[PDB]
Every structure is written in structure tokens, then in C-alpha cells.
Amino acid sequence: PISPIETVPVKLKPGMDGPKVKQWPLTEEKIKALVEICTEMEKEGKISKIGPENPYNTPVFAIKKKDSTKWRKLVDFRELNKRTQDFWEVQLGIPHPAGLKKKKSVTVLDVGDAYFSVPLDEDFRKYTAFTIPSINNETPGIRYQYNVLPQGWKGSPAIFQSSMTKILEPFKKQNPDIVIYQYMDDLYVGSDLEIGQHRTKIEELRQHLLRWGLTTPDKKHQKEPPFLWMGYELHPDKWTVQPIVLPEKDSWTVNDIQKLVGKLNWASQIYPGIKVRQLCKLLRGTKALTEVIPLTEEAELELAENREILKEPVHGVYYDPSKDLIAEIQKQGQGQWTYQIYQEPFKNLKTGKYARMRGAHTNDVKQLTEAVQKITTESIVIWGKTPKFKLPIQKETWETWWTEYWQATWIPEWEFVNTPPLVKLWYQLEKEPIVGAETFYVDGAANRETKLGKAGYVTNKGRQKVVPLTNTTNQKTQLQAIYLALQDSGLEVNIVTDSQYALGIIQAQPDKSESELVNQIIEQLIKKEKVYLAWVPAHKGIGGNEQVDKLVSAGIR
Amino acid sequence: IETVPVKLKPGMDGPKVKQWPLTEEKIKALVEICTEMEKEGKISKIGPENPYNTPVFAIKKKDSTKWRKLVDFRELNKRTQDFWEVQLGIPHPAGLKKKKSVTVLDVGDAYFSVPLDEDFRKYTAFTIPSINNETPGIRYQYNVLPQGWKGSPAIFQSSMTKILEPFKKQNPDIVIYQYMDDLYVGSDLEIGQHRTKIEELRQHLLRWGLTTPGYELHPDKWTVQPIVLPEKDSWTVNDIQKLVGKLNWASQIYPGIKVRQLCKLLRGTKALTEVIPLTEEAELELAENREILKEPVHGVYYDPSKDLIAEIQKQGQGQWTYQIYQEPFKNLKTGKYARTNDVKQLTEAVQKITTESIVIWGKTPKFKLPIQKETWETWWTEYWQATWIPEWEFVNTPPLVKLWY
Numbered sequence: 001p002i003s004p005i006e007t008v009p010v011k012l013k014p015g016m017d018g019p020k021v022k023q024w025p026l027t028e029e030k031i032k033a034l035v036e037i038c039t040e041m042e043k044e045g046k047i048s049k050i051g052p053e054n055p056y057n058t059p060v061f062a063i064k065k066k067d068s069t070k071w072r073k074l075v076d077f078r079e080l081n082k083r084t085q086d087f088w089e090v091q092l093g094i095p096h097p098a099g100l101k102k103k104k105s106v107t108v109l110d111v112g113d114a115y116f117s118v119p120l121d122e123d124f125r126k127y128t129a130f131t132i133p134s135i136n137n138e139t140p141g142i143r144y145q146y147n148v149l150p151q152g153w154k155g156s157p158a159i160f161q162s163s164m165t166k167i168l169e170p171f172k173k174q175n176p177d178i179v180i181y182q183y184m185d186d187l188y189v190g191s192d193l194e195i196g197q198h199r200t201k202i203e204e205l206r207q208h209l210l211r212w213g214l215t216t217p218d219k220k221h222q223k224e225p226p227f228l229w230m231g232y233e234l235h236p237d238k239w240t241v242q243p244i245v246l247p248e249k250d251s252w253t254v255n256d257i258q259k260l261v262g263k264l265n266w267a268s269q270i271y272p273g274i275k276v277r278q279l280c281k282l283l284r285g286t287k288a289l290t291e292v293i294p295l296t297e298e299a300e301l302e303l304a305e306n307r308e309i310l311k312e313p314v315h316g317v318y319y320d321p322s323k324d325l326i327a328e329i330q331k332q333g334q335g336q337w338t339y340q341i342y343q344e345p346f347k348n349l350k351t352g353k354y355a356r357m358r359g360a361h362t363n364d365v366k367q368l369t370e371a372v373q374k375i376t377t378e379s380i381v382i383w384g385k386t387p388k389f390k391l392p393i394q395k396e397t398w399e400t401w402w403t404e405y406w407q408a409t410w411i412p413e414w415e416f417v418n419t420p421p422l423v424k425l426w427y428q429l430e431k432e433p434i435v436g437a438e439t440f441y442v443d444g445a446a447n448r449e450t451k452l453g454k455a456g457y458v459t460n461k462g463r464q465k466v467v468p469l470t471n472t473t474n475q476k477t478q479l480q481a482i483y484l485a486l487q488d489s490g491l492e493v494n495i496v497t498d499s500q501y502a503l504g505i506i507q508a509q510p511d512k513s514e515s516e517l518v519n520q521i522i523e524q525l526i527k528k529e530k531v532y533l534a535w536v537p538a539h540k541g542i543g544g545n546e547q548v549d550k551l552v553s554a555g556i557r
Numbered sequence: 558i559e560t561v562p563v564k565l566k567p568g569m570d571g572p573k574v575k576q577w578p579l580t581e582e583k584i585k586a587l588v589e590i591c592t593e594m595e596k597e598g599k600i601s602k603i604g605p606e607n608p609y610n611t612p613v614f615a616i617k618k619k620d621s622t623k624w625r626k627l628v629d630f631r632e633l634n635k636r637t638q639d640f641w642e643v644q645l646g647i648p649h650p651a652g653l654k655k656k657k658s659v660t661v662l663d664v665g666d667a668y669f670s671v672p673l674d675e676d677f678r679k680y681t682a683f684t685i686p687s688i689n690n691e692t693p694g695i696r697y698q699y700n701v702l703p704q705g706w707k708g709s710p711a712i713f714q715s716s717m718t719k720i721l722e723p724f725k726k727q728n729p730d731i732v733i734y735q736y737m738d739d740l741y742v743g744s745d746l747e748i749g750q751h752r753t754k755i756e757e758l759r760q761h762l763l764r765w766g767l768t769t770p771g772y773e774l775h776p777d778k779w780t781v782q783p784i785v786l787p788e789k790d791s792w793t794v795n796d797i798q799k800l801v802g803k804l805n806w807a808s809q810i811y812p813g814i815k816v817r818q819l820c821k822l823l824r825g826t827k828a829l830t831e832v833i834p835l836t837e838e839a840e841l842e843l844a845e846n847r848e849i850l851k852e853p854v855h856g857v858y859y860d861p862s863k864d865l866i867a868e869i870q871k872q873g874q875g876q877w878t879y880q881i882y883q884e885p886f887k888n889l890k891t892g893k894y895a896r897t898n899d900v901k902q903l904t905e906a907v908q909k910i911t912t913e914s915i916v917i918w919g920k921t922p923k924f925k926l927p928i929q930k931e932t933w934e935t936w937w938t939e940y941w942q943a944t945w946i947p948e949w950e951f952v953n954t955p956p957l958v959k960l961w962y
């Protein structure tokens with residue numbers, strides 16, 4: 001049919017006119033094809049004849065269908081589209097299975113010839129005009145325009161979905177108990193009714209749709225959950241991901257690894273523990289897509305654990321609005337975090353992992369915070385509310401770090417849960433100087449054109465060392481100078497630097513960094529029992545900085 | 558009545574901003590408010606032919622359990638600046654900040670009386686999302702002047718004047734300033750008489766179909782937040798080294814801060830613990846330097862043309878310090894904010910600061926907020942109470958918190 005429903009008025013972009021692309025000459029058999037096809041559409045309203053008054057022409061093609069049985073009509077709209085107005089996005093998101101409510105009965109209906117069952121705005125048809133050529137361009141050729149939504153045009157998806165929504169509003173209203181999710185030309189209908197009263201309602205729906213020009217299946221409802229959708233397998237009861245299968249092969253090409261990594265990351269939504277750190281490390285570097293990569297020891301095992309986790313099927317359960325949401329986060333390895341979200345102890349709704357680095361120099365308390373943020377945001381989109389957290393951090397550790405940190409931080413209602421590794425700050429910086437403790441006045445400098453520096457120091461006990469360096473910046477000479485003060489130095493040491501930069505990194509108690517020096521300076525810090533770091537203005541001549549600065553920048557500067 | 562014709566800054570096109578995901582409770586809050594706003598014909602549903610979007614949230618009144626709709630028109634305000642700032646701007650009284658008392662009145666419901674140029678409406682399109690995207694998602698557009706829009710005050714400026722006219726003639730020493738949704742009313746009366754003159758004003762408003770809240774500011778008591786220098790009985794190398802660090806800072810701001818005496822004082826290579834004597838030039842330099850640090854920077858003037866910037870540092874213990882300035886380290890004003898959640902507090906500080914800002918300059922500042930973008934976005938609309946939304950970029954505070962500015 002052709003739905004009575006009002007039509008969405010569309011227009012072309014401001015400073016533009018309809019399309020005018022010449023029709024490239026087609027072969028005889030093709031010309032026959034289109035003729036047989038259009039005529040067909042025409043007899044049904046989908047299109048109509050028009051004369052040579054319409055200066056708008058858009059190219060047409062035809063290509064064989066499956067096994068070359070019948071032809072198909074391809075209308076390269078590239079031109080009308082660049083000239084067509086912009087619309088409102090069809091879907092700005094996809095429901096996550098875990099956010100769906102459990103249903104008793106569910107069936108999927110699919111709108112046949114959807115785009116062609118909706119009436120294109122009259123004032124716009126004139127632009128969707130094409131032509132069926134004459135053998136070796138002689139005769140005029142047949143001209144046709146559209147009266148319904150062209151299957152390749154910019155606004156068919158938008159306009160179709162909008163219409164299907166107006167067509168459903170009455171029905172949904174009459175049956176608020178029936179949930180209907182519309183994905184493209186498919187309709188997912190679920191209810192808490194009995195398969196009997198369900199199918200009854202279904203027909204009632206097919207009817208309502210018919211009254212509107214939309215034809216729907218009869219016994220080919222495809223309902224019968226399972227439901228393979230968007231990579232998921234939906235059941236009225238639970239849900240899980242499309243079946244994953246790990247190749248299991250001798251040699252792996254870059255292309256193979258990527259696919260693997262892609263599947264495992266897809267599996268991680270419900271399969272707890274999936275790890276891809278080792279496998280992902282193997283893809284660093286511009287490598288041919290067909291290039292074979294040998295699996296390192298680490299990787300070989302990681303693929304094993306994953307292999308293990310995937311053998312037994314795992315399902316996620318559906319959302320119950322009446323219950324709370326609990327989210328527990330575990331620390332897997334370094335920089336890696338996994339989490340589970342459930343309502344009833346251990347019957348997971350969704351799973352996931354966080355590994356994001358987030359700049360160089362960061363510490364577990366900061367990362368845990370980040371995972372909490374991500375899980376929170378995700379939790380809102382899917383369920384509409386934030387969950388309660390069960391974190392592997394002491395209320396103590398958290399309270400202390402948060403209150404002193406420069407950045408403002410929050411974190412929804414949480415609870416400690418002793419699930420090692422527990423998160424902790426691996427060292428603290430004294431606030432008041434350490435009395436009766438050597439005071440290293442470190443410093444550094446480096447010639448910019450040469451790249452030669454002299455990281456050194458001087459103490460209140462006469463000691464004064466000056467090691468030379470090659471290929472270091474003005475910064476590293478200050479970060480290297482602090483590394484020194486930590487080595488030839490006691491268990492308690494006061495360090496006085498003039499590198500706000502160095503002060504910055506160290507002051508944020510990082511326990512892992514991307515800098516080689518910074519990770520070294522960390523071991524030290526974790527070994528001392530008392531470290532005090534202070535700052536003083538660079539080469540501004542101060543008691544101590546000046547002096548070290550002298551043997552630091554005397555020559556090679 | 559007739560509609561005022563509005564246009565966008567040529568070259569620029571309507572807003573196409575994404576709708577931040579909302580919690581169930583605010584979605585329900587909003588479909589109720591929008592369901593009712595439609596009956597009253599203030600907004601009409603729209604179709605996919607509208608590609609535009611401006612985000613929306615739901616906040617709380619002056620703590621009353623009634624949810625208010627908050628449309629984030631930050632974008633469209635930028636796309637319209639020409640219209641509401643030059644073409645139909647609203648003058649700002651330099652006298653307002655001098656008033657002993659200033660009351661803020663929410664005259665926003667007053668805009669829904671005027672219609673919006675039928676041609677501009679498409680630009681006010683907004684979307685009420687749905688949980689887990691299980692539903693297309695309700696779309697609308699304004700027919701009447703919307704509230705977060707800086708275009709609304711400008712147009713309504715003509716009517717507001719007729720309304721206030723009598724009250725103003727009978728009360729010449731009372732300043733009235735309108736700034737996007739709110740009226741600021743200040744007088745040098747005694748709290749009693751002031752509060753009284755306010756009720757009087759509400760009665761006038763009331764006659765043009767417009768009720769009111771409350772909420773009083775005291776600008777004449779807004780003072781600078783000096784940069785303090787310690788004053789301890791004892792004194793350690795560390796204590797004096799720091800005293801030199803902060804002082805040094807006070808050099809690229811507050812011209813004249815002499816630190817040549819205090820510096821070079823007790824130098825060489827001494828332990829940090831080692832206590833030290835004192836100096837006569839010291840007591841003098843200190844005094845003089847701090848004396849200079851008490852009063853405002855010399856050479857710093859407000860420049861109506863340039864933007865305003867507010868920077869905030871988390872001091873600790875519910876303490877927050879901030880500076881408003883146009884040219885880095887050239888402070889127009891500095892302050893403090895004190896007295897549960899860090900985010901909850903910070904949001905409060907921003908609103909306070911924005912208000913002080915509006916009273917003093919008539920414009921809101923842009924904020925350099927010491928927090929993580931995602932965290933802020935996820936929670937601000939949970940403690941926010943203003944009708945406006947300032948500009949904000951998320952910065953990374955340096956070890957500058959040492960000095961208060």
C-alpha cells in the first residue's frame with residue numbers, strides 16, 4: 001500500500017537546486033531490465049511518468065541479484081543527497097540488552113517494503129527524477145519521478161522511523177502493557193501476557209498497521225526467541241553475545257590478531273575476566289596487515305585464560321527496576337580494571353573492563369576513581385540511575401587521598417570490600433621538613449643546541465656530586481638530579497628543587513609512569529621512610545640553589 | 558501582539574548540540590513539565606525535518622521539591638550575540654554593586670506570554686531522551702520566548718519597562734537591573750524598608766500575570782581577598798624559603814614588591830630545619846610588601862571588550878579560592894568560598910562567583926574548573942540552582958595553591 005499518514009515536508013539545502021547528472025548510456029539487456037521493473041513500480045504508485053519539463057535527472061543502474069536470477073534498480077543518489085537538507089539523527093544510541101526488562105512473550109514483526117509504503121512530500125518528488133535510456137542514446141528515454149521514499153536517499157531512514165512512530169502512538173496508548181522497540185524496518189514486540197493473549201494482541205497490531213499501509217508477516221513472525229540482534233542473542237529470560245569462536249591456528253597475521261581482539265572486547269560485556277593486554281601489545285607498530293606475528297610467552301597464556309573463560313556459555317540477566325544496582329570493581333593487573341554490575345548477588349546484568357591510561361604518571365586511587373566515573377556514566381545511559389559501589393579500597397585510603405588532592409573529586413555511595421589486590425597509596429610526602437636529615441639541593445641544566453647537561457647536587461654536609469649526561473632536556477636534568485638525591489641519600493631526606501615540573505609529577509604520588517626516570521624515582525620513594533620535597537625559584541640566586549647551580553651550570557651550559 | 562524578527566550571525570547555523578544522558582527521575586520530571594507546556598501551547602512537537610538541538614536538564618527551585626526545566630542555550634546565545642548585545646542590548650548600572658542590599662527576582666515565567674518569530678522557532682529545538690534508548694525520544698520547539706535564551710530579555714525589554722515605570726518613578730533611588738531571567742533590585746534602605754519595597758514591586762509584577770519567589774545579596778560588603786604572608790613567632794629555613802617563593806610570585810603582579818632584602822638573607826647551603834635570626838630591613842620589607850599586597854593591583858582596569866575569566870583552586874577543608882581576571886595574573890577581583898561533596902561545593906562556588914560577577918560587570922565569567930570533565934558533567938545539574946549557565950573549560954591546577962591567588 002501507501003500509508004495515508006501525513007507527509008514530512010522536506011526541502012533542499014539553501015543555496016542549491018535539484019540534481020542534473022547526465023545519464024550514461026546503458027546496454028540493451030539493462031535497458032530492458034529497468035523498463036520491466038519501473039513499469040512494475042508504476043502500476044503500484046511507487047513512481048509516476050513525467051515529461052521533459054523536469055530539468056532534474058539522477059543516474060540509474062541495474063545489477064543482477066542472487067545467482068543472477070533477477071535484476072535490481074540502483075539509483076545513485078549521491079547528487080540529490082548532497083543537495084538534500086539535513087535531518088534529525090535516527091538513533092543516537094542503541095539499547096543495551098542489560099537495560100531491557102524481562103518479558104514473557106516476544107515476537108518480531110518486519111515491515112515489508114517500508115520505504116515504498118511511505119509517501120514522499122509532493123513538492124519534493126520533482127527532484128527524484130531519473131531516466132530509462134534508449135538503445136545507444138537515440139529516442140528520448142522514459143522519465144519517472146518518485147511518490148514514496150527512495151531506498152537510497154538521505155531522508156528515508158529519518159522520515160520512515162518518524163512515521164512509524166506516529167502510526168504506533170495510538171496502539172501503544174491502548175496497550176501500555178505492550179513494549180515495542182523499533183529498529184529500522186523491524187519491530188520488536190514484547191509483553192508479559194500469555195503466548196495466547198500475546199499473538200492475539202500481535203494480530204491486533206498487524207491490523208492497526210494495515211489500516212496504515214504497512215504490510216506485516218503472517219506466520220513468518222521470526223519471533224521465536226532466540227534473537228540474533230546487534231551481536232547479541234536475546235532470550236525472553238536472559239541475554240548473551242553472539243557465539244564467539246577462537247580460530248585456534250598455528251601462525252597469526254596482524255589481521256588475525258585484530259579480529260581476535262575485536263571479538264574478545266565484544267565478549268567482555270558479559271564474560272568476566274577477558275584480558276587483551278598481551279594480545280594488544282603485539283599490534284603496536286605499523287605492521288603489514290598480512291604480516292605474521294609470533295605470540296610471546298605472556299600472550300600465549302592470555303589467549304589461554306580467554307580460551308578457558310569462553311568454553312562454558314555465560315548469560316546476563318535482565319533489569320528489574322524495583323531493585324538496586326550494585327557494581328563491584330576489581331584490579332586485575334597493572335592499569336587494568338574489571339567490574340560487574342548486578343542486582344542479586346552474582347547474577348550479573350552486565351560486565352566490563354577499564355584499562356584506559358589517561359596521561360602519563362597516574363596512581364591506582366586515581367584510576368579507580370576513573371573507573372567509577374565511567375561505570376557511573378554508563379550506568380545512567382542504560383538504567384537511569386547510578387549504582388552503589390563495592391570498591392577494593394579502604395575508606396581510610398580514599399578519605400586521605402581525596403581531601404589533599406588538588407582536583408575536586410566525588411564518588412557515589414560506596415563500600416569497602418576486601419577483594420585483593422587492595423588499592424593503596426604506595427608512599428607519602430612529608431609536609432614539614434625532616435629534622436636531622438640531609439638536605440640535598442639538587443639542580444640541573446642542559447645546553448639546547450648541544451643536548452649536554454649536568455645533573456648534580458650539593459648538601460648541607462659538604463657532599464657535592466655532578467654527573468654529566470648526554471641527550472637530556474632541561475627538564476630531565478632536573479628529574480635526573482632528583483633521582484640522584486634519592487640514591488646517595490639516607491632513608492630520610494629533604495630535597496630542595498627548582499623544577500616546578502618535577503615538583504608537579506612527584507607531588508601527585510604517581511605509582512606508575514610512562515617516563516623511564518619517573519618509574520625509577522618511584523622505587524626510591526617507595527623505599528625511603530621520610531621524604532620532603534620543597535621548591536625555590538630557579539636561577540634567581542637563593543641560598544643553596546645558587547651554589548649547586550654554580551657547579552651545575554659552570555661550563556656545559 | 559506582533560513578533561520581533563530575529564536572525565543569526567550570518568555564516569553561522571542553528572545549534573546542533575547533543576543531549577547529555579539524564580537519570581530516570583529527571584526524564585519523568587521533564588515529560589510532565591513538557592506535557593503541560595504543550596497543552597498551554599508554549600511548545601509544539603516537531604518532526605525529523607528539524608536537524609537542530611539544544612540540551613535540557615531539570616534542576617530544583619529555591620529548594621522546593623518542584624522540578625524546573627533548564628534549557629542549556631549556551632550555544633544559540635553565541636549564535637545570536639549580535640542580536641542581544643548590540644542590536645537590543647540591556648544597559649548595566651555601575652551603581653548596582655554599591656547598593657547596601659540586592660534582591661534577585663526570577664521574572665522568567667514572564668517570557669511565555671510573548672510569541673517567538675515563527676521563523677526562529679526551529680532553532681529552539683530540544684530533545685527529551687529515554688532510558689536505554691528504548692524509545693525514539695520526544696522532540697519539541699518553543700513558540701514563546703524560551704527562558705535560557707539571552708534573546709528573551711532583549712525583546713521583552715520593552716514591556717518590562719512599562720511594568721516597572723510606576724515603581725521606578727515613585728522610587729528613584731532604587732536600581733533595577735535585568736539579566737537573563739532575573740531582575741536585580743538594590744537599594745540603600747534598611748533591611749526592613751528594602752524587603753518592604755520588594756513586596757511592593759512584586760505587587761506591580763503581579764498585575765501583569767507574574768508572581769515571584771527572596772534571596773538577598775550585600776555587595777557593599779564585598780571586599781578583596783589579600784595575599785597573606787605568614788607571621789609566626791619562630792622561623793625555620795624552610796619557612797623563610799617559602800616566604801621568598803610566594804613573594805617572588807607577587808612580582809609578576811602587584812608592581813613594587815621588593816624581595817631583594819629578604820632574599821640573600823640566610824643563604825649558602827644550610828639545612829632546612831635550621832632556625833634563623835631576623836633583619837630590620839626584613840620587618841620593613843615584609844610590612845611594605847604585604848602592605849602592597851593588601852590593596853588592588855595598579856594598572857589593572859576592566860575592559861568591556863574582552864572576556865572575563867574565573868579560576869578556582871581547591872584549598873582543602875571546604876575552602877575554595879578564586880580570581881576573576883582578563884589578562885593573566887592581572888586580577889580584577891579575588892575571593893574565597895567556604896562551608897559535603899567536593900562537586901557539590903564547587904558548583905556552589907561557581908554560582909556565587911557568577912552572581913557577584915553579574916552584579917559587578919553585567920556579564921558572566923568563563924571558568925577554569927579544577928576537576929575532571931566527565932565528573933563535572935555527570936553531577937553539576939544535581940546541585941545547580943541558577944537559571945543561567947556560564948562558560949567552562951576544565952583546567953589542571955599547578956602547585957600554585959601555595960599562594961592564595
Ligand SMILES: O=C1Nc2ccc(Cl)cc2[C@@](C#CC2CC2)(C(F)(F)F)O1
Pocket residue numbers: 095100101102103106107179180181188189190191225227229234235236237
Ligand atoms: O524490554 C525488552 N525485553 C525483551 C526481552 C527479550 C527479548 Cl528477546 C526482547 C526484548 C525487548 C527488545 C528489544 C530490542 C533491542 C533488541 C522487546 F521490546 F520486548 F522485544 O525489550
